[PDB]
Design a protein around this ligand. Structure first.
Ligand SMILES: *[C@@H]1O[C@H](CO)[C@@H](O[C@@H]2O[C@H](CO)[C@@H](O)[C@H](O)[C@H]2NC(C)=O)[C@H](O)[C@H]1NC(C)=O
Ligand SMILES: *[C@@H]1O[C@H](CO)[C@@H](O[C@@H]2O[C@H](CO)[C@@H](O)[C@H](O)[C@H]2NC(C)=O)[C@H](O)[C@H]1NC(C)=O
Lengths: 50, 49
């Protein structure tokens, strides 16, 4: 068999899922400061009851 | 007098050979912003008069 047809190949672009990605979370940013003022306050205001 | 001709076939673009990819395993590191953290013990005496 010979053919008079001209081929053409089209495959659909497959699905692709995007997972959530973060370089730094806000908890790491809150921990970036050398002294979280709030936690220092809460610790130091327990001295009499401790 | 007037005489024309049909155009002949053309050179069709070659399908490019394509990219080559290297399979590998990768671990991506970033800048550290976390402070170094180590536990210590404090000794002191509160005084009052
Ligand atoms: C039609 O679709 C693609 C080309 O776009 C070919 O399918 C892939 O061919 C590669 C090798 O070139 C195989 O490793 C894959 O398994 C094939 N499928 C996919 C989804 O990549 C296919 O061969 C083309 N048709 C013809 C007749 O070549
Ligand atoms: C990836 O590997 C293929 C292997 O076949 C390379 O094929 C080359 O195709 C070019 C056309 O630009 C020729 O000049 C070379 O002789 C081919 N090499 C071989 C070994 O077949 C292909 O070119 C490579 N990737 C790129 C980007 O060129």
């Amino acid at each position: 068999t010979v053919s008079t047809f001209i081929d053409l190949n089209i495959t659909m672009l497959e699905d692709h899922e995007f997972v959530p990605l973060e370089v730094y979370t806000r908890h790491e940013i809150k921990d970036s400061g050398l002294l979280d003022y709030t936690e220092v306050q809460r610790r130091n205001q327990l001295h009499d009851l401790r | 007098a007037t005489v024309v001709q049909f155009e002949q076939p053309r050179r069709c673009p070659t399908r490019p050979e394509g990219q080559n990819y290297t399979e590998g395993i990768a671990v991506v590191f970033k800048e550290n912003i976390a402070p170094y953290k180590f536990k210590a013990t404090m000794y002191y005496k509160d005084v009052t008069v």
